[PDB]
């Protein structure tokens, strides 16, 4: 006979002890552990709600992978690359580039907890977490690898995080802030709770819905399998938060959640927003970006956050306004400066699409539509020089994404600036400035790409110079309109 896990599980996490040969603080240094002075004994209350054990883990993960790879193998000849809308192909390129090596970085966040968390259950669940993120990094390198021979842009599944391309810098600045750059408890709160229970569902399940509509089952099956692991290891954050609250650290906990959610939001707005509302073919848009946000972030995540005893973020109303507006401007920017992306942005403004956008975002045509009108006119008149930039966008010193606002009939744009230690910083929102002010030592000497350009670090100081600095190794790699402006034939 075998004894049920419930009977022996406690012994697997009975691993705290009282140090005698070094001090508790030497063993768990605050800068790495983030225990906020809460003594070892209090951490033994930590109780992970989504448990597993080693023999169950290897058996189940074996099954998960067999499925993912079997489906990929069975569909190699489904002509996805050849027959898919180019906007869908760009969605794949964007995803793998933005995600693959970041998953591998998350191994480090999990490792930080496995070594430095004072909670024994956390250290064990973080060990499975290390393994999960290893899986995710390896899957998301293996899957796009077969397309290298088709398209140099797929090289960026591996190359992106090794580059200074603007979006890769935005990704690294975020992940290095919430995953690899902070103590174990900060990781538990910012990565496992805020990012992994909050936002990743948008990219790994929301996008899976669009993938299924688009007929890309290899991809939909892959990312939904990945999320099954996320759903387990993300459950490390809640018990940490509850423990902090019980131990008089609610204010500190709340601030970390608020910071992480906002930082994640700005990144998802530039990555997932354009994909869901513009790149994905209209027929395959299961819901709009905003609709998915209301499902996943408001309906599910925010409700869970309240249930655990935290408060809605201070910036709630600003966040709601942003969901209506931000990604439309981010999309416009990514497309106008497409040559700096490693994917081919689709404009997504054919009349049929503009009607959809108007339905999903009343007033769209009188705002972003005004700029797209000018662009469309230029395209129809073959004035192609007017659809490519001759200067740099101004960039947020927090998110590393350009500073945008609402264009058109009710134009409104605001930059939030800050003098600090003899330097002038610029932020794309009140919250981004607030994030900086929460922890200036984390950020103060970081230089964004525009800062570097102005300081003489990018030579020559030209578009070509910047493109080389960003790591583009050939002309084919630079982004172009997904459809080579064929969409104009609809206008």
């Amino acid at each position: 006979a075998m004894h049920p896990r419930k009977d022996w599980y406690e012994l697997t996490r009975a691993t705290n002890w009282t140090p005698s040969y070094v001090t508790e603080e030497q063993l768990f240094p605050e800068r790495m552990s983030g225990h906020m002075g809460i003594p070892l004994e209090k951490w033994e209350s930590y109780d992970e709600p989504y448990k597993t054990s080693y023999p169950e883990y290897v058996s189940i993960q074996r099954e998960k992978d067999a499925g993912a790879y079997s489906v990929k193998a069975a569909l190699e000849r489904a002509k996805i690359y050849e027959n898919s809308d180019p906007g869908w192909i760009s969605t794949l390129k964007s995803h793998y580039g933005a995600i693959a090596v970041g998953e591998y970085a998350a191994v480090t966040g999990e490792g930080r907890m496995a070594r430095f968390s004072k909670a024994p259950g956390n250290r064990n669940m973080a060990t499975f977490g290390m393994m999960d993120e290893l899986r995710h990094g390896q899957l998301q390198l293996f899957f796009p690898h077969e397309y290298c021979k088709k398209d140099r842009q797929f090289d960026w599944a591996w190359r992106a995080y090794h580059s200074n391309e603007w979006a890769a810098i935005a990704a690294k600045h975020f992940f290095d802030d919430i995953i690899t750059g902070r103590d174990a408890i900060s990781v538990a709160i910012m990565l496992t709770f805020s990012f992994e229970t909050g936002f990743t569902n948008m990219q790994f399940l929301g996008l899976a819905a669009d993938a299924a509509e688009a007929g890309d089952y290899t991809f939909a099956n892959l990312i939904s399998s990945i999320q099954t692991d996320e759903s387990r290891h993300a459950q490390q954050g809640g018990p940490a938060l509850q423990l902090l609250i019980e131990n008089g650290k609610r204010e500190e906990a709340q601030k970390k959640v608020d910071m992480a959610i906002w930082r994640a939001w700005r990144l998802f707005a530039v990555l997932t927003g354009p994909v869901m509302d513009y790149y994905t073919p209209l027929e395959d848009r299961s819901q709009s970006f905003k609709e998915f946000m209301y499902e996943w972030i408001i309906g599910q995540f925010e409700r869970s956050l309240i249930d655990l005893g935290l408060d809605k973020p201070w910036y709630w109303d600003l966040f709601l306004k942003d969901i209506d507006e931000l990604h439309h401007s981010y999309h416009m920017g990514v497309w106008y400066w497409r040559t700096t992306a490693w994917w081919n942005p689709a404009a997504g403004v054919t009349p049929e699409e503009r009607d959809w956008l108007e339905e999903k975002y009343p007033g769209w045509n009188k705002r972003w539509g005004r700029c797209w009108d000018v662009i469309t006119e230029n395209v129809l008149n073959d004035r192609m020089d007017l659809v490519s930039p001759e200067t740099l966008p101004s960039v947020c010193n927090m998110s590393q994404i350009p500073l945008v606002g609402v264009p058109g009939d009710d134009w409104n744009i605001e930059v939030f600036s800050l003098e600090h230690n003899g330097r002038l910083y610029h932020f794309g929102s009140e919250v981004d400035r607030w994030v900086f002010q929460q922890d200036p030592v984390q950020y103060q000497n970081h230089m964004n790409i525009v800062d570097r350009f102005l300081a003489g670090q990018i030579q020559p100081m030209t578009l070509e110079g910047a493109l080389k600095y960003m790591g583009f190794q050939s002309i084919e790699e630079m982004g172009k309109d997904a459809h080579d402006f064929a969409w104009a034939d609809k206008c």
Binding site: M332, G333, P402, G408, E414
Partner: protein, 83 residues
């Protein structure tokens, strides 16, 4: 004499880096910014372009130069049309 500013043009969707000259008049600044906006993402229109510090109410005089303005490099300006 190069003088970098960050400029938001009226009805555009973003703020851009525009390098002007220490001795440029606000009229010239506005034209250098307009270059990167009008007929690209912003419809051309009648009226006089003016320059103000970002979100400010006061417009700089048309003839005033960047040097005379007191602006610091990398500060943010708006380019707008007279109401």
């Amino acid at each position: 004499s190069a003088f970098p500013v960050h400029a938001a043009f009226e009805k555009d969707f973003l703020v851009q880096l525009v390098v002007v000259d220490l001795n440029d008049s606000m009229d010239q600044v506005a034209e250098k910014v307009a270059y990167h906006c009008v007929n690209r993402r912003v419809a051309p229109r009648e009226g006089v372009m003016r320059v103000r510090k970002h979100r400010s109410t006061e417009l700089f005089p048309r003839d005033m130069t960047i040097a005379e303005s007191g602006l610091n490099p990398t500060e943010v300006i708006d380019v707008v049309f007279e109401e």
